[PDB]
Each structure stands twice: as C-alpha cells, then as structure tokens.
C-alpha cells in the first residue's frame, strides 16, 4: 500500500522490540520513530494535521490509509495507490546505511577555504 | 526625551513577539509534567521555581516594543496571583491563545472593537456556565484531593492541610514557615497566645522547663505605664487576701515595681507574673479589650475615667491556667459568657467586610482566630535551602487552592471544564459577523490549557483534545498515568474560583491588546 502506510504498519508491529543496552534501546526508538516521517510529510504538504491522520491510519488495519488527492480515507488498494516492495525496502535500507556511516564518523578532511 | 512611533502591523508583530517570549518562558511549567525555571538573583543564589507568576515577574526584554508587549501580558499573571493565589500559568496560556487568534482575525479585515465585544459576551456566558457546572467541596477527602493536586501530586501535603483545616476550624488561620528537620510537621495552638514573655526571669517557679505556670489566676489589664508601686497596693493586698495568683498585663513595668513584685514572689506572699501588652497603638488597645472580653474583666484606662488605685476584684478577669515562656504567653480556658465573645467576633467581622488592604484583613482574621477558632502553623522540611524554597511555594499554592475550593466548590480538572463550557456555548451569536468571529475566537482559545498540558507530557495535543471533546460529563485525560477516565473519580479537582478568575483576567487584558494601532516608546 502506498502513501507511506506500509512503514507505519511495520513500525506499529515492531513496538515491542528491545535491545541489550540502554543505548541500543535509544537506537531502536530512533529507527522506529523515523518510519512515520513520509506520511506525516505528505499530510503536511497537503495541508492537514499530520498527527490526527497518522493516528487514524495507525488505528486501522490492513491496507486502510489516507488518500491525499481526495482527502478521504479508504482501502489503499481499492483507490489504486501502490508502491513496489523494492522501492520501500531500498529507501529504508539506504537511509539506515548513510545514517550509520554518519554516526560513526570521527574526522573530516577538506581543502582550505582559499 | 525623543520618541519612536510605530503604526499598524509593525507594532502588532513586535507586540506579539514580546508576548510570545514571556508566554513561552511561563508555559513550560504547566501540568503534572512541567519543569522548573532557574532565575538568576543579583544578591544570592539562583531560585528554581515552577510557579508562573514568579517566572513572569522577572522577564524584561531589550527591544522596547517587545518589552511593551511582555509588560502588558504580565498583568494577567500578577492579577490572578493577587486574586486567587493560584492559576497564573493557565491565565497566561489563555491570554496568549486569545491574542494570537484575535490578531489573525484582525489581519483578515475585521473590526477590532466588535471582536472585543464578542469576546466579552462569550466570557460572560462562560462564567455563568461554570457557576452552573460546579459542585460543593466540603468533605475532608475532597479537600485532600485539591491540596494534593495543587502541590504537584504530593499526597503528604494534602493530608497535612486537610488535618490542619479539620483541627483549626472554619474560623482559624494556617501559616507556612521554614522548618528545622527533614519532615513536615504541624503544630496547632488552642486558646489565645501573644508574643510577650515575662519581664523578669526570677518569676520562674518551674526551672525544669523554664516556664511560669499559674493555676486559676487573676488578670489585671492595665492600659497604662506603671513605674511606681504605690498604685498597685490595693489590688495586691486584695489578691493576697484572696490567696490565688495574679497576672499583670500592662504597657510596661519599670524597675521599682518589678523589683517589688520579684521580692514578693520569692517570699511566698503573692504569686505575681508580669508581661507586656501585645501590639503597638490602636491594635494594642483592641487586643487588651479582646483579652478583657475573653477573661471577663475590665480594662483600667485613664481615657474612660477610672484609676488603678480604685480597682477591685470585679475589674480582674479569671482563667484556668496561664503558662508564660521566654517568648509567648498563653491563657487557657478563660471564664467568659459566650454572648460577649459572639458579639465581639461579629463586630470584628463587620470591620473585616469594610477593610481595603489585605494586611488589615489578615490581622483581623488572626484576631478572630484567637478569640474563637485556632491558629495552626505548618513547618516545611528540606535538606537544603533551594529545595526548602521550592517546597514552601508548593505548600502555599496548596493552601490557597484548598481555601478557594472550600469557598466556591470544585470542577473537573485538567482543562476539561473549559472544554465542556465551550461545547455548551456553541450556539451563541452576537450582533454582526465580527462579533460572531470574536465569540469563535474565545471558544477556540478555551481549549489551550489542555493542549499545553498534553504537550508538556510529550504526547499529541490534538488527538487527546479530539478524544476528550468526543466524550461527555467528567470524561478526561490523566496526564500523570496517560489514560482516560472520570476526572472526579481519580481525584483531579480544580476550584471553580481559580478557573473563573483565570478566564476573566485573560479575556480582559487580551481584548484590549487586540485593539492596538500605534505604539509610542523611547528611543534605543
Ligand atoms: N493520491 C495519493 N495519496 C497519498 N499518497 C500518495 C498518492 N499518490 C502518491 N502517493 C505517495 O507519495 C509518494 C510519492 O512521492 P514522490 O514525490 O514520488 O517521491 P519519490 O520520488 O521519493 O517517490 C509515494 O510513496 C506514494 O505512495
Ligand atoms: N494528573 C493530572 N492529569 C491531568 N491534568 C492535571 C493533573 N494534575 C494537574 N492537572 C491540571 O494541571 C493544571 C495545573 O497547572 P499548574 O502548574 O498548577 O499551573 P497553574 O498555576 O495554572 O495552577 C491544573 O489545571 C490541573 O487541573
Ligand atoms: K506552573
Ligand atoms: Mg496551582
């Protein structure tokens, strides 16, 4: 399902995940909180309130979601709003990769501003 | 000096910016999950406080138009603190909401005065609805709940205040002072006490406690300065024949008379103790008259036409026990016909009603407590001084809230009552469309306190607001436990007076701030 609701589905599924350390728990909460960013930004660009729509979508199940073009809810499959699984998986994995690279970076070397 | 003059929207945006600075500093302390603000003091250490008016009274800005905005919105918190003693953060939140919405409506081409009239009409209707929505708060459990909620969910404070209010009575007074230990303690005084000790340590007959104890004495109330013993001979001889102790409450006793008294006390002739008359001036006269009424005696004064030499036993009062320490004198179980006490306290109530300053009113209330009720003192215990100050401020907030809740009743707390009122006033209309817009502005601003409480918890204010608006009755949101339920059943109570006062003062200041067009101030 499109519109950013698949990531909300998985984030709501994974709310029970725990880590071995209080720092690994902060990392797990950081990654799960970032899966709602697409739908929230879509609703923000359309002009509604992201929190109410996100709560309504999380409350639903399956392919329930929000149509941004007509500003109504419904089954995302029936409204014809789809994403291939490869697109979502690739975007999530590459975002996590670059975030991990930037988190463990100790030095940056560049030419002088001259 | 020379001035700077700004017109229209420039003035309004500067003013709103100053309002926003002060409101953003104040609003971080609202609810069970608000935080503390550190205030720098020029003389001393910083103070860490969660009180709205304390934070508001410190804010001053470098820019002059923004400073005007902040100085104007500061009066809401000041006035709410003066009137109710609590509810200043809510008043500031409401004022900021009204100002923001009203400026948005003004920028759309509305007439500011009609918006102000609509806001006034909505607030009047809202106050009537709040009065209709209230319920009495008389049992001790509800008073404990109010004191607990006002002290930032501290059960011990609520229990202590409920016990104090139960013991001291409806006519008594309760004060808060610094303690010496780590635990809060309550000391209640029954009877009349004034802060005057004996004039000579030799009067002490019980060195174990260093206190002068007299059983069934006479009280000689001398409204004059006594230096020569020649005046007291008749009454002293009469009391010596009587065979029971005597107490002198006089303006002062000089060396000769005091020396004669101390010589006689140790010889076993008479049991005499002498203390000073409390107060200075007219209040001293009034309290001597009060002691005369309580003890059933007559004040010996020159201004009425009697002399102390002609005094007899009929002019001397009586008591059951008198205990005098280095600092305080207490008179216990004094003989007096009740009608005199009720009459005196009645008169004192009439000059209570005809009093302007709060100092005079509190002195009169202390007098009424001494004559009829009691006086309770609560000591606050804390390890350091900053902690002591923060806890003492919380205890004072709780005491004020319990007083208000007793005198007017309680409504459901957490911002729910304002939402219920605004839901009830959904069909109110004015004379023209600008007035209807102003009514809508007020009704929308009535939901700001709950939204800020939910923000301070890290939740979503709009989801909770919608869920609470969808319910009926006392249905609300518990921000401490993060659950929905009955506001009354879980003990989240707010006095009606605090809510009404916050709404009134916020509307009064914000309606005027909406109608600005020009601002004149000094130059940088
Ligand atoms: N009518 C719609 N309602 C809600 N979401 C939509 C709709 N149409 C497309 N989307 C979502 O918007 C996203 C498209 O954003 P886009 O600007 O194409 O960014 P990207 O290039 O990263 O895909 C897709 O994830 C799609 O699921
Ligand atoms: N557990 C709770 N759940 C929801 N609301 C609460 C709770 N405890 C207190 N409140 C509300 O929070 C407000 C307390 O804010 P406070 O910091 O006392 O500011 P004020 O100076 O306006 O009283 C009260 O209106 C009260 O109704
Ligand atoms: K506060
Ligand atoms: Mg309070």
From Swiss-Prot, chain A:
Residue range from the parent sequence: 413 to 526 of 548
Chain's gene name: groEL
Subunit and interaction comment: Forms a cylinder of 14 subunits composed of two heptameric rings stacked back-to-back. Interacts with the co-chaperonin GroES. Can form asymmetrical complexes, composed of one GroEL and one GroES, and symmetrical complexes, formed between one GroEL and two GroES oligomers. The asymmetrical complex is the functional unit. It was suggested that the symmetric heterooligomer may represent a transient intermediate in the chaperonin protein folding cycle.
Cell location: Cytoplasm
Record note on domains: Each subunit is composed of an apical domain that binds non-folded proteins and GroES, an intermediate domain and an equatorial domain that binds ATP and is involved in inter-ring interactions. Forms a large central channel that appears to traverse the entire length of the cylinder with no obstruction. The central channel of GroEL functions as two cavities, one in each ring, that are separated from each other by the crystallographically disordered 23-amino-acid C-terminal segments of the seven subunits. The entry and exit of polypeptide seem to be restricted to the apical end of each ring.
Protein name: Chaperonin GroEL
Physiological role: Together with its co-chaperonin GroES, plays an essential role in assisting protein folding. The GroEL-GroES system forms a nano-cage that allows encapsulation of the non-native substrate proteins and provides a physical environment optimized to promote and accelerate protein folding, probably by preventing aggregation and by entropically destabilizing folding intermediates. Also plays a role in coupling between replication of the F plasmid and cell division of the cell.
Binding residues annotated for ATP, in chain numbering: 3, 67-69, 83
Lineage, top ranks: Bacteria, Pseudomonadati, Pseudomonadota, Gammaproteobacteria, Enterobacterales
Assigned protein family: Belongs to the chaperonin (HSP60) family.
Organism listed in the record: Escherichia coli (strain K12)
PTM entry text: Phosphorylated reversibly during heat shock.
């Amino acid at each position: 399902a499109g519109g950013g609701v698949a990531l909300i589905r998985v984030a709501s599924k994974l709310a029970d995940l725990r880590g071995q350390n209080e720092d690994q728990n902060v990392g797990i909460k950081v990654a799960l909180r970032a899966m709602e960013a697409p739908l929230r930004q879509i609703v923000l660009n359309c002009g509604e309130e992201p929190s109410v729509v996100a709560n309504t979508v999380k409350g639903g199940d399956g392919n329930y979601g929000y149509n941004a073009a007509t500003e109504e809810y419904g089954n995302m499959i029936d409204m014809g709003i789809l994403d291939p699984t490869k697109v979502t998986r690739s975007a999530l994995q590459y975002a996590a990769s670059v975030a991990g690279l930037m988190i463990t970076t100790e030095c940056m070397v560049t030419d002088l501003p001259k | 000096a020379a001035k700077d003059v700004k017109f229209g929207n420039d003035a309004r945006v500067k003013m709103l910016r100053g309002v926003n600075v002060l409101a953003d500093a104040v609003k971080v302390t609202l609810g069970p999950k608000g935080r503390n603000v550190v205030l720098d003091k020029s003389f001393g250490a910083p103070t860490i406080t969660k009180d709205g008016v304390s934070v508001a009274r410190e804010i001053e800005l470098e820019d002059k138009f923004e400073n005007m905005g902040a100085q104007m919105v500061k009066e809401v918190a000041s006035k709410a603190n003066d009137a109710a003693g609590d509810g200043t953060t809510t008043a500031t939140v409401l004022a900021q909401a009204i100002i923001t919405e009203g400026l948005k409506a003004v920028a759309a081409g509305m007439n500011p005065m009609d918006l102000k009239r609509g806001i006034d009409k909505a607030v009047t209707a809202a106050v009537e609805e709040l009065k209709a929505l209230s319920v009495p708060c008389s049992d001790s459990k509800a008073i404990a709940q109010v004191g607990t909620i006002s002290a930032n969910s501290d059960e011990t404070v609520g229990k202590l205040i409920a016990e104090a209010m139960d013991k001291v009575g409806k006519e008594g007074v309760i004060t808060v002072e610094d303690g010496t230990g780590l635990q809060d303690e309550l000391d209640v005084v029954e009877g009349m006490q004034f802060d005057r000790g004996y004039l000579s340590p030799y009067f002490i007959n019980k060195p174990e406690t260093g206190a002068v104890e007299l059983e069934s004495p006479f009280i000689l109330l001398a409204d004059k300065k006594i230096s020569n013993i020649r005046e007291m001979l008749p009454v002293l001889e009469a009391v010596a024949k009587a065979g029971k102790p005597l107490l002198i409450i006089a303006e002062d006793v000089e060396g000769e008379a005091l020396a004669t008294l101390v010589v006689n006390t140790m010889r076993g002739i008479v049991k005499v103790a002498a203390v000073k008359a409390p107060g200075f001036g007219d209040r001293r006269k009034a309290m001597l008259q009060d002691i005369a009424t309580l003890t059933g005696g007559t004040v010996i004064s020159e201004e009425i036409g009697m002399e102390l030499e002609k005094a007899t036993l009929e002019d001397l009062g009586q008591a059951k026990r008198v205990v005098i320490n280095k600092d305080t004198t207490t008179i216990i179980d004094g003989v007096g016909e009740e009608a005199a006490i009720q009459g005196r306290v009645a008169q004192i109530r009439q000059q209570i009603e005809e009093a302007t300053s709060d100092y005079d009113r509190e002195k009169l209330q202390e007098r009424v407590a001494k004559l009829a009720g009691g006086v309770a003192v609560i000591k606050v215990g804390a390890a350091t001084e900053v902690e002591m100050k923060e806890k003492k401020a919380r205890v004072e907030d709780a005491l004020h809230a319990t007083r208000a809740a007793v005198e007017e009743g309680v409504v459901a707390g957490g911002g729910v009552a304002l939402i219920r009122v605004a839901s009830k006033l959904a069909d109110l209309r004015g004379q023209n469309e600008d007035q209807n817009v102003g009514i809508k502005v007020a009704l929308r601003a009535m939901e700001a306190p709950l939204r800020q409480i939910v923000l301070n918890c890290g939740e979503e204010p709009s989801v909770v607001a919608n869920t609470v608006k969808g319910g009926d009755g006392n249905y609300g949101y518990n921000a401490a436990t993060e659950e929905y339920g009955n506001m009354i059943d879980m003990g989240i109570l707010d006095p009606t007076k605090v809510t009404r006062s916050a709404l009134q003062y916020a509307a009064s200041v914000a309606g005027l701030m909406i109608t600005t067009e020009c601002m004149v101030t000094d130059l940088p």
